[PDB]
Amino acid sequence: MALAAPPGELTLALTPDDKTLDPASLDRALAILAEHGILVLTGMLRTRLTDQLRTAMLDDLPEVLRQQDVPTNFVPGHVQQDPPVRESLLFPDVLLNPVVYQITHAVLGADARNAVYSGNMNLPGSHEQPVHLDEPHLWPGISHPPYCLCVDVPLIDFTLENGSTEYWPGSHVLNPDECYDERGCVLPAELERRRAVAPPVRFPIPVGSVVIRDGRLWHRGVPNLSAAPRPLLAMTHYTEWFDMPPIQLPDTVKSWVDGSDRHTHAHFVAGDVDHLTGDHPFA
């Protein structure tokens, strides 16, 4: 079902000045994540920040496309691309956003940590991804609470035309036997059973927005039918006890990243980090 704006049931409208949500707003935010598994927060990030990140990823795309094996998510046109980890492009309001961490602290605990700083470049003429979850349930056939929240940052206006992500509301709690293949794709029989009860939604998302969703939420990338690549910056917050490799960051940001009560699972490196290949000498 294809809408003209983020649906009110999933959406909290903010400004870049909002540092923390009042108790009633936080309760509504958590009730949406619990019931629907996806929360859209509009107006969170200044144009100044999203401009620089968009520019930096579009400037890097040639280097990504020049690789012998171009890393692709499931199908052509969905390119895996990490944004730069240069000091000049690492922003506290993006990595350590006070509203994001207020929400992930309330869901995952005070010791929750960001362990992903990545991205999805959706190219013109891209194919339809299969419906999947990014993070699996921890045991098959078992109902358990969240252990991870994906934090998606559109770097342009997302439209129905340019590949705004398809989301399956309430799909984050579903874990019947034989539901997921080895790639985290939803088996077609389970897809169609769910569609009858709670069909998916797709909607425009204005740049400045942050989407927070259960890492187990069913979703898929869809064709970008615009003339321009559609960049997404992706982070994921995990419970402290979930094993993840650290984010490689330059030690020029160690002072404000390692200080924070907004935790990052980070390894600090002497030089510049190679964000595209991970091929710096003490990786």
CB atoms within 10 A of CB 61: 15
| Residues found in the chain | 283
| Binding status of residue 60 toward Ni ion by CB under 5 A | no
139 binds, among ligand OGA, its own copies, Ni ion, none (CB under 5 to 8 A by kind): its own copies
* Site membership for Ni ion, residue 134 (CB under 5 A): yes
Cβ at position 78, least distance to its own copies in Å: 25
59 binds its own copies (CB under 8 A): no
x/- string (CB under 6 A) for ligand OGA, residues 124-163?
A: -----x----x----------------------------x
State phi, psi for 248 to the nearest 5 degrees.
-80, 120
State how far the alpha carbon of 100 is from the alpha carbons of 31, 45, 158, 188, 193, in Å: 15, 11, 20, 33, 33
Interface with ligand OGA (CB under 6 A), residue from 131, 232, 233, 249: 232
User: Residue 219, interface with ligand OGA (CB under 6 A)?
Assistant: yes
For residue 34, give both structure tokens.
Answer: 């619990």
Among the listed residues 179, 138, 200, 172, the one whose alpha carbon sits nearest the alpha carbon of residue 36: 172
User: What angle (nearest 5°) sits at the alpha carbon of residue 107, between those of residues 8 and 102?
Assistant: 75
Q: Looking only at Cα atoms, what is the longest distance across the chain?
A: 54
Sign of the dihedral defined by the CA atoms of residues 256, 259, 265, 268, in that order? positive
Site string for ligand OGA, 3-42 (x = CB under 6 A): ----------------------------------------
Minimum gap (Å) between residue 244 Cβ and Ni ion: 16
The binding site for ligand OGA (CB under 6 A) comprises 73, 78, 120, 122, 129, 134, 163, 165, 219, 221, 232
The binding site for its own copies (CB under 8 A) comprises 138-139, 142, 144-145, 147, 239-244
The binding site for Ni ion (CB under 5 A) comprises 134
